[PDB]
Specification:
18% strand; 508 residues; 34% helix; six-stranded parallel beta sheet; magnesium (chains A, B, C, D); alpha/beta; globular; homotetramer; 3 domains
């Protein structure tokens, strides 16, 4: 009964801290906060999501967090629960995702904090102090997860071993104002500069005019794009690196060039990543000078050249490839869309196809870039994005969430489609499966051979709408009404990829 | 190149230590020992198994280890690899499975040892000493995994950071003889005694005549069975507990009875588990006296009564339940079979149905009892068991491996069926899926509702033979020829389970 | 030889990062960076300090860090080295001290980072990239230790497993500008407010007029002191807590009062500590209103009352107590002094005696408040403070470092006085030992009995100047010339302490 | 109050498990089991030892454990307590010492087990089950510490977070019989064999006739000694290694000779240590054949030669060296003595001087071989050895405990002499301090210079009897009556050591 009083206080404070979604798995033991959780679900203060696979649950929670930017909880209930959530916790660490893991008695350094509540004790004499202690600890967990004081969001472990009021007007027990992390850096823009924008990059208005190689998940500061294929054809004297870029081969080459100084600008304190020649680190630039017009003209000309080369070789290729599918999805997007990209080929293919990400919410598990949970991540991101839209009060249909994943990723996370009728289901999620039987050392011997999985039969097993579509129909079909969740499968060829990429190189 | 010399030495010593199967996943980085591994595969000294899902790989390796009792390696190649192998490592710890995890730079206390090789250095002057160092370290890993000196087998982490001969006649570099762990315990059998035999129990000839409640995975010392339903109807004055029993409600009740002394006999040193009233611990019994004939008569009569009650209520029930399926499988078994049981309902249902396990190799992930990887465990156990049979030189068809799993377990580990044509596939594995849409706190709300997954469509997606069969046809169908892997689905009712179990209680 | 090239690069970058002092112990194995270290010592770029006791070495390094605010390294060389440095690492964590621990192959969560260099490899082809990699990693360690990006200084573990130029003009390889951590908090000063200033507090000009209970190590923002004995006699409606206050019983009472809202202002992001009723957290206050004159008058009157009570009962007491010694030291201080306080009685006694800390550098290991290493901390702080003074170029005698410790602390850290003639020794360190045979549960049974250690004989054993002095001579003797290190022992009574504190309470 | 019931049960079960001595430090918090502990002390069931230095406490506990072979507890009470006990825990791990660390809420892999009790709950309804649970957990801790089932004794962490009867006749709750760990190994003694006996070696009657190089702490199986200086002058074809030998340079050379097969015989399961050419491992030998008489004659002649060379160069040397002191102590010993050796020079010097260890209990912290706590180890070993003698009922004076340590070790652990009048003090401990100002890389620069500590003044500070004695008076003085604890200081020369060792080599 006191463990009941404690749980209701914790759940109430989590709700006050912005937690709207909680993920739960059936377990050997009663869940932490379980009766308090479904009571909050019954009263509409949160919504529970139940999954059987604990690894699935973590990636669902990741999607629920990245879809609208809120902290999300997962509650553990079994002897396999810690181990099964490992992968999502690693992703949440590297991608700085506010994932709160609830336990009721091992994650080591992956979490921002590991905090255990005191057991609930029968003592009406000090209900005031227990209530303050519990809500203060909950705000501690929330702050560590959201990076409210550290500007370094990430997963937190919150153990509760197994109703007094919170603050007035639904306020959090301990309020933490917006924190401003400032580290200004002098940069002279007259030196030939390229901006490399990676995962987690901030927005820099004073850099908007510079040639920018932006990863799909990086927000764009301006409108002077530089295609990644143009970069090896250029000789920048200076590089401004935003966030953590990892995608492109020519970026890794350039960032490792001791001849070229790199200025790393991050939104948080975590150390510049992949360049050993970082000259300095900061959060923003204090600029002098301006780029040479000849430098801008040369970069803009190289961008158009690289863009034309990819677009023309795609158009002239006789077979639909995964790159054609990525280009088709990119062309079909429009402001308001949420795009969820598999961390392998989709994110790279969309970058090579030259996606204009302005107006688009692009999500990809670029933290550790596994294919695990991509389906559940897309489902979670759709649910969280649609929930934010409904909260707006707009009468419109929910915004589209479009996921692009390969067949290997889809088949290995297909169990993420198993959602009970008792559970929330997206209203406007379309998963585009680029099916070529492949990926992208003896382990590669499986890639040389098709898995030959019947994707349509797989979707029918889960009673998810599936349609086999040609790449030219993808755009129109993405506008067509259908089930709240549906899979659009596009057959793609893998045998002509070397021919296609050789044609691109021959056109450059 | 020196890192190549090191890898070939390590792989050769692993082979000398009894490693026949190695599991590998495609990864961001080159695999540890990878070129040495496939070279050993090419020369037939081992066989590689490639999987994409790293969690799948671990449970496949578990099955490959428990099928014939040999040490098995898994080689890690990605940033998601440590986290994805957590669950299988926990199982290997609690089930004492010799699972060797290979890395090339976090498992904490789950492993018996965490050993890192020295980097391979260019130094022909001391090839003799490097070779001795590497092979000695490999025997260290092997011994820790197999419990060669500790009698406590389990997982080991072996890091190799990235050809000189071993001993003559294929011998291991450092030989470890059979270790005999002896802890004799005086027990007077004249006191009314019941034997409770759990997972990991040893064989005790001097206890064979006693009434024994044996879990399906426990080896039988004798032929005086006591059905678990008979136990609450009896008043033993003394309990001899073998291994780690966890299955039965009346066993937990009895083992927790402070009035009843418990003598724990284990094959290894790990501490008596679930009884707080363990009077003593040992490895074997030094017995005096003999059980009263009246005690044996009473236990044997209670056993027949409990057996008759379950069998009669099953026969009279109008609908096929999961218990009917478990009873059908048990009746179809014969000496030489390997039985693989899902860790939830199957192991309990087979126990309630009264399976005679003599002559049968019964496997179940009873270490932590998750449903994860049950399909891959069954596949691995079949492959290892059939490989041992082929090594025997017998011209016979391979022995049958029969797995019994629920539909929930099958659907959540169905991706274990995704095996490339380049990979080993069992010859005589039949997975029996007891499909009732259920399992066995708000998380349970999904159990009240069917998943409604089309299991036949799921198997067709993976191109695995599937047949929908009635429980009376199960026995004959299990004898029928088919694909090397096949699924037999038996539809079962979940709505009449309370009626069925009330009928059992009313007959007791 | 390559491991030599690596070490010289690391040491050079550490020097560029502000490391002036390195602590070293003789060990089973060659020290990390050892030949590079003494070469830097020979060229005057750093100075090495050699100690035999590894725990002593850590506290010496702490003092060397807190004396002038610089990062300090300790280099490990034995199988006892990790365990022996534990206590200083815990202190460095809680006190946010930039302590860099160097190893050459376990500290867990106590360190800000655990970073291992790559082994030095023979490869002139990429000396440019190795040099950038090593110096970048060193700046990473330095930044984590100093909190250059996190504003959360602390210990770091830096493993180097066992000359290319750095930046021009001695600059660090990766520059990190001053980081500004900002979290403004609205506070209305018209509400009756008291400021509680603890260890690690910042300076707040807009709070200078408020009644402030400041711990001895807290910097003073203003000149409106409130004696801690006055606090229970007052009824503040609001508390502004700066830093982490832990000292005073009435502070813990007030901070735990649910009726009183607490606003926590910290210089870094670490979470408000000892109050469960923290209403909000920030880094600075945005104030409105002003304190009532009646509130200021009442607090100032209560302060004078509490001050007079302590001073008068001390003057009238017939025996010298530890409190008399603390008051004598406080009265003898003057701007420019460094005061080092034992973490037990000295810091509390100096607070009760009402020390005016303006102009004084007050150090105390208030992180975890052990008595371990207080002598070596004082020695290290003196050496670092005097080294900063010499760098100034002032012809004056070095500033005084005065340490106040109890006899128990002195005897248990007396081996810190063992400094070889080959090692740096302070020029103006005076350790005042308040000797009453006591401290301040069956463990307390030793306090009831004197240790009876001859402190003078103890100092003579270490050939440290020692003088037995009466409390009235302490001030004049602290001005008298003597050895660079000397101990002034003041005999104090412990039997009349209850009488003295009862007299204080009777005067309040 | 329930936390009181729990503590009394735990302490009672610890006493039933053989715990006679408990070590305690005054702390920030109430000690775990504290009131139960002193109550057991008051009733004479245990004796408490109070120390202020937590590192001192651990080494005192080590000595209390190795003196008579019993499990010993240490109870932690402060925020510095975990870190300060690290070094003793490492020693206990490597030396396999049954050290039980009690906490009341981080040691990682150093401990055999980390076990936390359930909080004491107010529930008379199940006092029977709580009592069984607590006593069972205590026997679990005890068994893990003593290696009762694992034959691998070591430290254990036992957390109790903060009277029902145990078994009849003072028996332990869960009894664990003597465990026999058996791993027989075939060895042919006709091959030229030498036995190398190290720390932790067992006794092997069937090996007693073989030439044996025994470390001082190794028990002797026979009477055919081989001086370590004779080993490089011989060419054994086979080596039987007992325990973990680490002392001698020529042993490390021989054990690393790939040409020579090594058979490792250990009393427990831990893996053969320092030889990479271990051919096999076991616990005992099954022998065939017999050594050649010519081989025995050659080894015996080489032993006499090496013995004569050391003895003659010592006798002819003009100055007393540390080796002379070690030889003087060895010659003064007699059956019944306990010898405690500093882990640096003393253990090696006594080996070089050729000590006959038959009848002698030789202790040395050879686990990690630090000098820390050698004084407190000697004190603890004396107290435990004398307590066993008193339990025998013999009217004789207690047996002598003689410690041999260098001046560096004595000065750095001199605070171990600080023992309150409230605490147990040995009756017959004599510490012999071999004082030459030295030990045995820039860290060595302190060895070239004397510390010049006045050891006599140091002892007077602690009011420990100290006498400055010439090496020829050591034997007679060791027989002379004195205080229960006394220090005998022998001045030794360090400048003529190279001359002395060159004279030894010139005589070989």
């Amino acid at each position: 009964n006191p463990s009941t009083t404690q749980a209701r206080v914790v759940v109430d404070e989590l709700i006050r801290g912005g937690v709207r979604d909680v993920v739960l798995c059936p377990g050997s033991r009663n869940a932490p906060l379980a009766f308090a959780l479904q009571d909050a679900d019954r009263s509409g203060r949160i919504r529970l999501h139940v999954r059987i696979d604990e690894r699935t649950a973590g990636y669902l929670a990741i999607g629920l967090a990245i879809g609208a930017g809120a902290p999300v909880c997962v509650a553990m209930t079994s002897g396999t629960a810690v181990a099964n959530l490992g992968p999502a916790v690693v992703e949440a660490n590297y991608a700085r995702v506010p994932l709160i893991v609830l336990s009721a008695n091992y994650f080591g350094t992956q979490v921002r904090a590991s905090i255990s509540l005191g057991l609930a004790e029968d003592a009406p004499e000090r209900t005031s102090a227990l209530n303050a202690t519990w809500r203060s600890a909950t705000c501690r967990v929330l702050a560590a997860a959201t990076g409210a004081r550290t500007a370094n969001a990430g997963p937190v472990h919150f153990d509760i071993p197994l109703t007094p009021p919170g603050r007035p007007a639904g306020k959090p027990w301990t309020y933490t104002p917006p924190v401003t992390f400032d580290q200004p850096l002098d940069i002279d823009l007259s030196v030939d500069t390229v901006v490399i924008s990676g995962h987690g990059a901030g927005v820099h208005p004073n850099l908007a005019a510079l040639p920018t190689v932006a990863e799909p998940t990086a927000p764009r500061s301006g409108d002077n794009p530089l295609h990644p294929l143009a970069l090896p054809l250029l000789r920048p004297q200076q590089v401004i690196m935003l966030g953590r870029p990892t995608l492109h081969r020519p970026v890794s080459v350039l960032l490792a060039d001791a001849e070229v100084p790199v200025f790393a600008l991050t939104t948080g304190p975590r150390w510049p990543d992949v360049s050993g020649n970082s000259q300095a680190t900061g959060t923003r630039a204090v600029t002098t000078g301006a780029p040479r017009p000849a430098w801008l003209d040369r970069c803009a000309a190289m961008n158009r050249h690289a863009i034309a080369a990819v677009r023309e070789q795609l158009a002239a290729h006789p077979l639909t490839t995964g790159l054609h599918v990525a280009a088709a999805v990119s062309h079909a997007l429009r402001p308001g869309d949420q795009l969820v990209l598999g961390a392998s080929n989709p994110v790279r293919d969309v970058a090579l196809a030259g996606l204009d990400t302005r107006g688009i919410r692009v999500r990809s598990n670029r933290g550790v870039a596994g294919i695990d949970g991509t389906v559940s991540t897309a489902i979670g991101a759709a649910l969280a994005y649609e929930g934010a839209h409904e909260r707006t009060g707009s009468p419109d249909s929910p915004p589209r969430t479009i996921a692009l994943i390969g067949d290997l990723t889809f088949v290995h996370d297909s169990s993420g489609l198993l959602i009970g009728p008792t559970e929330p289901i997206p209203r406007s999620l379309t998963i585009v499966v680029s099916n070529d039987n492949g990926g992208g050392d003896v382990s590669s011997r499986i890639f040389g051979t098709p898995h030959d999985v019947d994707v349509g039969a797989l979707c029918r097993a889960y009673h998810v709408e599936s349609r086999q579509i040609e790449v030219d129909e993808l755009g129109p079909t993405l506008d067509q009404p259908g089930a709240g969740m549906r899979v659009l499968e596009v057959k793609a060829d893998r045998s002509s990829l070397r021919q296609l990429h050789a044609a691109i190189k021959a056109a450059l």
